Design a binder for this molecule. Structure first.
Ligand SMILES: C[C@H]1CN(c2nc(Nc3ccc(O)cc3)nc3ccccc23)CCCN1
Length: 469
């Protein structure tokens, strides 16, 4: 009564009624649309969530690319509990009502072999991919895992036991949860010595080791970001702390470090000390560059572009020309929408830390420039092509996440950079206003030379340089 729709048309497969199994409703413009201008598997443009689930577990062929993109992006259109219920509903396939003749027929044998078993195995593959690559869904919702484990314990049949045991094995391993191929260089120390963590500061630590330790820290933060933290702009929305925890740590580290570089410059009231502070920051930038940490490079560029720093003409003119040329070459990476940076990224060799902000910007642009739904007369369809476009960008982020640095962690220095709090008790607005007022104090408008302020420390301003020892 219901049927599934090259050089010969074979007999149609008989299916159960949609009244008892939602997924066999005929495809139409009102429930699924394909990228027909794009090219063996048809590319899904959008559909109802029921049709997306049907195609996620399609009986005719496997679709690994859709499975991957779906499981990365589905939270922007479907809740995890809802997804599990839909997959279970998909699994529990009723057989077509036997005709007066059946009351095993050839049609029913076809149905179990061509439809039921393939769809059920597709679902088990989706479960496997789900727990393998998105197990945080199950850490975040213990009931979701209980439902899944209970369901797979109900799956009968020798043919499916190996899939069930493969899923259970992954769950087992997930619930349970540094070597060097060549010797990392010795940790570098300047004025602050090992263990003296209360004296740690921008000018007392070694500029080489500041850049190394910030690079190890930023590499770790970058590596831990999952693509679903970026989908649907969830890191800016209500539940951001639950849905984007690693992304937020990355963003907040960058905010704090950029403000700290600004603070170090503007609070150096003594002119010669401030020029030495800026010069040291440029040396840290150089080492970031040597390490291919372009996140760190552009954090420093961002800091010197802050108004309170940028307006310090006397400080930039007092820089050695050699320091000026290094700074300005890095600033030019960012110009014309990061043209030169993007050329450099495509050519570098690992390990590296890419500039994270450009991905965030491109995802926000894509989220804003595409509608979540395709508009229909009846129920509007989920715009899946939008999610694919976002997944393309998150796929780029992941290329650089398995690239460890041959550098030794310094635990005290790592804690120092994890605990930076340049704002004190000020709000961001208060702190920004404070920095600008301090800028005005240390280089007043139209001063022909900066006023004299006392030196802040009694140490040499001389850098140890960026040659490793
Ligand atoms: C004279 C500038 C001062 N300045 C900067 N100068 C330079 N380079 C520079 C070239 C020639 C020179 O004689 C001295 C410095 N690089 C920067 C990089 C990041 C932020 C600001 C600046 C800030 C205001 C613009 N006017």
């Amino acid at each position: 009564s219901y049927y599934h729709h090259l050089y010969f048309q074979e007999q149609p497969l008989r299916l159960p009624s949609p009244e008892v199994y939602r997924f066999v409703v005929k495809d139409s413009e009102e429930n699924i649309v394909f990228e027909d201008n794009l090219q063996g598997i048809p590319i899904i443009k959008g559909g109802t969530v029921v049709k997306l689930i049907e195609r996620l577990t399609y009986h005719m062929y496997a679709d690994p690319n859709f499975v991957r993109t779906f499981l990365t992006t589905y939270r922007s259109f479907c809740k995890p509990q809802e997804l599990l219920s839909l997959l279970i509903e998909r699994f529990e396939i009723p057989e077509p009502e036997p005709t007066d003749a059946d009351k095993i027929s050839a049609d029913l044998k076809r149905f179990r072999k061509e439809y039921v078993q393939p769809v059920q195995l597709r679902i088990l593959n989706v479960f496997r991919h789900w727990v393998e690559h998105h197990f945080y869904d199950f850490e975040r919702d213990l009931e979701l895992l209980e439902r899944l484990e209970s369901f797979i314990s109900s799956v009968r049949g020798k043919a499916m036991k190996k899939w069930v045991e493969s899923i259970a094995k992954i769950i087992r391993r997930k619930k349970q949860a540094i070597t060097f191929e060549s010797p990392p260089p010795p940790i570098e120390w300047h004025i602050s010595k090992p263990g003296q963590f209360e004296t740690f500061d921008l000018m007392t630590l070694h500029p080489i080791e500041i850049a190394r330790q910030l690079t190890l820290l930023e590499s770790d933060l970058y590596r831990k970001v999952q693509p679903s933290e970026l989908v649907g702009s969830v890191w800016t929305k209500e539940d951001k702390e639950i849905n984007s925890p690693n992304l937020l740590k990355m963003i907040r580290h960058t905010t704090n470090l950029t403000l700290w570089f600004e603070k170090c410059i503007v609070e150096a009231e003594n002119f010669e000390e401030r020029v030495a502070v800026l010069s040291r920051i440029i040396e840290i930038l150089q080492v970031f560059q040597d390490l291919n940490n372009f996140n760190g490079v552009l954090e420093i560029v961002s800091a010197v572009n802050s108004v309170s720093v940028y307006r310090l003409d006397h400080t930039f003119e007092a820089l050695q020309e050699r320091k000026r040329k290094i700074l300005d070459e890095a600033v030019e990476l960012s110009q014309d929408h990061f043209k030169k940076y993007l050329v450099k990224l495509k050519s570098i060799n690992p390990p590296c830390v890419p500039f994270f902000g450009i991905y965030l910007t491109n995802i926000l642009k894509t989220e804003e420039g595409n509608n979540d739904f395709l508009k229909k007369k009846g129920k509007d369809l989920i715009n899946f092509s939008k999610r694919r476009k976002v997944a393309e960008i998150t796929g780029e982020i992941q290329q650089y996440q398995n690239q460890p640095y041959c550098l030794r962690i310094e635990p005290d220095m790592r804690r120092f950079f994890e605990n930076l709090n340049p704002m004190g008790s000020a709000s961001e607005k208060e702190f920004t206003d404070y920095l600008f007022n301090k800028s005005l104090e240390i280089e007043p408008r139209n001063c022909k030379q900066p006023p004299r302020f006392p030196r802040k420390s009694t140490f040499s301003l001389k850098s140890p340089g960026i040659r490793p020892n």
